[PDB]
């Protein structure tokens, strides 16, 4: 709080002491640099909780989305929520995708790129066929199914990121 000096011989001693006590007391309910048990507050600095924390409402983290055709008609839709990327494989194979080939239309942006190579498992609609797409740290995705020229690729999951 903003308090005035209290000193020997001051004109309004009792009034200044009172106003100083009230300014301080106000910060024990709301405002100032103190965190309260009520109201919406913005908190800065590394807050380390050494005990158990319970959140009964929502816990919102930093979010960012991206979607793009990796290549061959395969679309990858991503949503970064903290250190996890939620993925969804979509699209339709519209051209010949060679076995073990890079998907060269669009690379996964750096902010969505993993530290180590991640293998995203998927399934082709209408049969028992599975494939996987690797996301390397470069974002140049690689097809690990056999040579394919058609089909509907699908698959929802997650992979880790860091910062």
């Amino acid at each position: 709080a903003s308090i005035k000096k209290v000193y020997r011989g001051m004109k309004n001693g009792a009034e200044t002491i009172n106003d100083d006590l009230e300014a301080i007391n106000s910060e024990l309910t709301s405002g100032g640099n103190v965190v309260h048990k009520t109201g919406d507050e913005t908190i800065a600095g590394k807050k380390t909780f050494t005990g158990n924390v319970e959140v009964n409402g929502s816990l919102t983290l930093p979010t960012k989305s991206w979607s793009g055709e990796l290549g061959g008609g395969i679309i990858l839709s991503l949503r970064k929520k903290g250190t996890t990327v939620e993925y969804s494989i979509g699209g339709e194979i519209s051209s010949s995708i060679l076995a073990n080939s890079n998907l060269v239309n669009r690379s996964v942006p750096n902010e969505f790129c993993p530290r180590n190579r991640c293998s995203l498992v998927g399934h082709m609609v209408g049969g028992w066929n599975a494939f996987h797409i690797d996301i390397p740290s470069s974002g140049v995705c690689q097809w690990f199914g056999p040579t394919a020229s058609s089909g509907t690729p699908r698959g929802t999951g997650t992979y880790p990121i860091d910062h």
Binding site: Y7, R8, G9
Partner: protein
């Protein structure tokens, strides 16, 4: 005193208001909160005649208000003169007092 000098930080003519009071906090004879009126007695607005030089205010007051005791400079726009329970308070508007003393003609 009757004629007192307040040295200040302004390049102008700051307004000065003088007050007289007894038994203010920490001036009481028998210690803190020992006086008849906690916080201080009647506050008297001292009539002043102001005169200005560069960073100097000449404060002329009636001779009854002359009280030379201890000159206390408070780290803001206030200077006090304390003689036991009696205080002579100088409040400057829009500047800080840097030094205060009785005028020597």
């Amino acid at each position: 005193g009757f004629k007192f000098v307040l040295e200040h930080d302004s390049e102008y003519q700051p307004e000065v208001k003088v007050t007289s009071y007894k038994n203010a906090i920490g001036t009481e004879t028998d210690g803190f909160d020992s006086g008849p009126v906690f916080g201080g007695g009647t506050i008297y607005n001292v009539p002043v005649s102001l005169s200005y030089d560069r960073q100097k205010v000449y404060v002329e007051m009636p001779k009854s208000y002359t009280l030379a005791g201890d000159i206390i400079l408070i780290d803001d726009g206030t200077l006090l003169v304390i003689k036991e329970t009696q205080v002579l308070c100088f409040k400057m508007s829009d500047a800080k007092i840097t030094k205060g003393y009785v005028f020597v003609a």
